Amino acid sequence: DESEALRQARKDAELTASADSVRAYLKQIGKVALLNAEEEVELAKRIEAGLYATQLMTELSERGEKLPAAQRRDMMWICRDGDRAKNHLLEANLRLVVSLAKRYTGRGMAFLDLIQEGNLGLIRAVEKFDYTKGYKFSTYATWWIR
C-alpha cells in the first residue's frame, strides 16, 4: 500500500517552498495538529499556572525581595512552561483565524493583513480563556477574532 516512492515523494514536495506568500503561510499552519477538546483543557490549565507564577514575581520585583534558589527556579520553570503552552494553543487554533478571515476579503484590506489582525485577536483570546466553563476554545475564540 505505502510505497517507498510516495514516502520519498512526500518529503520532496513538503520541503520545497512555494512562491505564493499566501500559500506558504497556509503550508506552515497545517503542520500543527488540531486540538482535542480535553487537550485544550490541559493547555488552559498550564497557561493559568504559568500566567500566575508570572504575576507573583512581577510585584515582588518592585517591592524587592525574591524567592530562594530552589523556589524561584521552580517558580521560573512554570513561567516558561506556561508561556510555552500559550504558544502551543495559538499554533493549534491558528487555522481558526484563517477560516473566518477569508470572508472579509476584498474590502480594501489585504488577506494577510486580515489574518494577522485576526491572529492578533486570537492572542488576546487565549489570555482571557477560562476552562472552568465546559465550552470548547473554538467558541470563545471566534467572538474575539471577528
Binding site: A5, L6, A13, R23
Partner: protein
C-alpha cells in the same frame, strides 16, 4: 489500451516506451508533483484535482 488506440503510429509507440514510470498511482503522483510543488501528495489529493 494505449497500445490499442494509438498503435497505428510509431511516434506513440516511441512514447509509451520512453515512458518513465508505469502505474495508475505513480502517474497521478507524478503529475501532482509537477503541478503543485510544496504540498503533501496523497493518492486521494492527486485523484481529486
Amino acid at each position: 489500451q494505449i497500445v490499442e488506440r494509438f498503435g497505428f503510429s510509431e511516434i506513440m509507440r516511441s512514447t509509451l516506451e520512453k515512458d518513465n514510470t508505469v502505474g495508475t498511482d505513480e502517474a497521478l503522483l507524478d503529475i501532482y508533483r509537477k503541478l503543485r510543488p510544496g504540498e503533501p501528495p496523497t493518492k486521494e489529493s492527486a485523484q481529486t484535482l
